[PDB]
Ligand binder design. Structure first.
Ligand SMILES: CC(C)CN(C[C@@H](O)[C@H](Cc1ccccc1)NC(=O)O[C@H]1CO[C@H]2OCC[C@H]21)S(=O)(=O)c1ccc(N)cc1
Ligand SMILES: CC(C)CN(C[C@@H](O)[C@H](Cc1ccccc1)NC(=O)O[C@H]1CO[C@H]2OCC[C@H]21)S(=O)(=O)c1ccc(N)cc1
Lengths: 99, 99
């Protein structure tokens, strides 16, 4: 698809056998969801650093479907106020910015 | 241009008779630069809200050139750690996300 930016670019995601809404965020290195059960072994990760750190669970090699397109990558699970699709996943779907 | 997302999408901006680097950020509603002198009347604005607020100077109707393309819009000036081009400006240049 082609997504214009007059509204926040929030899209439907398939992840962990569930559906979630998430913000497509070119400003985010990583993809993070609030609390979802995912498969495999996780490890703790501290993220952020600008004013403090948030501890999250890092799951690698998670399949997601982002508005119809399949991606595999790292998904962080933790107490984010806003689910986010970051560049790690956007590269996998071939997302570009165009003007 | 077409910008891939394997690196942070940082681009050269012309603003206030100066050059700055800024992050193209689809996750940001607004455009914010660290401290730059701009023309016109500003007003204070509190931004954020997620953990606290940052007070910034809001300048309206500021021309910028974002990798070659002219945009006019609101520019916030304040103590951001990272200069950001947000959706307010991205819509003016016709920036889209495509996959
Ligand atoms: C890490 C996520 C929970 C949230 N994100 C913001 C985060 O990257 C901020 C971005 C940031 C940049 C400049 C100034 C303030 C915040 N950086 C940061 O270090 O925040 C710290 C704040 O306390 C800790 O808890 C979260 C991470 C740690 S994000 O995915 O990029 C993001 C960015 C903007 C929006 N609207 C929604 C999500
Ligand atoms: C407002 C700017 C200074 C910074 N931005 C982050 C900001 O939107 C966070 C985004 C955010 C989202 C979820 C969790 C934490 C932070 N939201 C927020 O309310 O932050 C508050 C923190 O203290 C105050 O100072 C800054 C604004 C106030 S941002 O332009 O979207 C931005 C986002 C990510 C990066 N890497 C760089 C910039």
């Amino acid at each position: 698809p082609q997504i214009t930016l007059w509204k926040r670019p929030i899209v439907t995601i398939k992840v962990g056998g569930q559906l979630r809404e998430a913000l497509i965020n070119t400003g985010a290195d990583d993809t993070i969801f609030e609390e979802i059960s995912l498969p495999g072994r996780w490890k703790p990760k501290l993220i952020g650093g600008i004013g403090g750190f948030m501890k999250v669970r890092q799951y690698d090699q998670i399949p997601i479907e982002i508005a119809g397109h399949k991606a595999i990558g790292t998904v962080l699970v933790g107490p984010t106020p806003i689910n986010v699709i970051g560049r790690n996943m956007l590269t996998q779907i071939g997302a570009t910015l165009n003007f």
